Amino acid sequence: SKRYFVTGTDTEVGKTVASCALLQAAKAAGYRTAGYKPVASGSEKTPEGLRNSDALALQRNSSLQLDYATVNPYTFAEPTSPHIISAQEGRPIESLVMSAGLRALEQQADWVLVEGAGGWFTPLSDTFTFADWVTQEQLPVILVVGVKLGCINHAMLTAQVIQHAGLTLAGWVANDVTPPGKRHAEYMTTLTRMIPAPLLGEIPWLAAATGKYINLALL
Amino acid sequence: SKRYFVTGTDTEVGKTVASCALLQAAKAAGYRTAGYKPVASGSEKTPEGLRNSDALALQRNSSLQLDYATVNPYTFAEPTSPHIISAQEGRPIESLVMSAGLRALEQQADWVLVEGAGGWFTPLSDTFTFADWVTQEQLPVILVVGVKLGCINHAMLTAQVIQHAGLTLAGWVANDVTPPGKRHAEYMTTLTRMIPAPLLGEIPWLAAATGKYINLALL
Ligand SMILES: C[C@H](N)[C@@H](CCCCCC(=O)O)CC(=O)O
Ligand SMILES: C[C@H](N)[C@@H](CCCCCC(=O)O)CC(=O)O
């Protein structure tokens, strides 16, 4: 299986929008696809337990029919850092459970997209971060950049930290989080120049069928 | 002279609020102080030329009477990345002019605070970033963290990049950018654990005399 990890420059950059566009283009290329979000916080109660909306989006954009707990093993109600609510609730987030879940998807999908929570360094416990599990798994990383003032700094910080860990930065996606602004073209040129990985495509400001904005031939 | 560079985790984290609190505590410890903001964008027209409000704050919080152009040599009207507006206006931002300005302040001040623009990696030209000038100058760095969801990731990214460049991370300041929230104490404990530098103090949410929140004995 092809496997990619998706991270973002900050918490509200539309990372799941880019993950659904990636899943839609891979489906169009003929892959049997699966979205995986191992850890999620900020969830609603239903008759079946807590459900996170980003994980629901990954589940409905996967080409395989998948059960929710296969897509998202760890679900917390409160929208805070996973290591705070994990400790509060008394439910440890285990690296072995996160990796088993990935293997179970590779039994049926040949293109798997793994979406983290937050940015690169989100803590999962007091001694373990999301970056430690991605490094452990040796996943190639796709960086989603929300295009706004301040994003050059955040895209460069994330790119250098991933490369320092010896991981491949597979590419980046530009998400237009605001309407067209004055320096949009100069920001896109600077970001293309500075991020050492191919620009996979740009998704326009939308306040759903977005696969056409991704060029999968660059991954 | 003691010299410190101040940077922030993102663009609106109240970095100049923390710089004024630092200048106020150094003045109270008996230092002859000077604030320096070499590059600024987002400025107003006056009879005397363009004036940036952050640079004005540094100027009025310095214990020496200083002229504006001594505090801020490069002033651009439009609030965008300095390398975009510098190219548009045809006014190169020169490293020699930025360093000369710092020397001129050391002629009269014995505690100098240098405030950058944006975050760590702000571009000054197509081949030069603010981080290259700070590394060139070998300034110790003070990191200002706006405490909100997403700041653990940004504080860790900035801290590792500075240390990788071989610079000293002198300390960090927590700025409360919102009213008291649910996980404020757990966020402060996590940030203290993870940032490899002393917490210099915490400034409370204020919608001016803030020197009392800084412990200069840790710098
Ligand atoms: C206009 C802002 N307040 C600030 C510059 C932000 C540059 C951001 C570059 C990037 O995208 O990383 C200007 C200033 O602080 O004087
Ligand atoms: C609740 C958020 N949407 C998100 C977690 C953000 C953690 C931020 C940690 C940090 O401060 O860096 C949860 C999620 O995406 O499922």
Curated annotation (Swiss-Prot), chains A, B:
Subunit structure: Homodimer.
GO molecular function, one term: magnesium ion binding
Signal peptide: none
InterPro entries, sorted: DTB_synth_BioD, P-loop_NTPase
Result of changing N175A: Increases affinity for CTP 3-fold, no change for ATP
Subcellular location(s) of the protein: Cytoplasm
Entry keyword annotation includes ATP-binding: yes
Residues engaged in binding Mg(2+) 2: T16, D54, E115
EC number: 6.3.3.3
Superkingdom of origin: Bacteria
Family: Belongs to the dethiobiotin synthetase family.
Organism annotation: Escherichia coli (strain K12)
Protein name in the entry: ATP-dependent dethiobiotin synthetase BioD 1
Top-level taxonomy: Bacteria, Pseudomonadati, Pseudomonadota, Gammaproteobacteria, Enterobacterales
Reaction equation(s) it catalyzes: (7R,8S)-7,8-diammoniononanoate + CO2 + ATP = (4R,5S)-dethiobiotin + ADP + phosphate + 3 H(+)
Annotated phenotype, changing K37 to L/Q/R: Complete loss of activity
Encoding gene, per UniProt annotation: bioD1
Active site (UniProt): K37
The protein's required cofactors: Mg(2+)
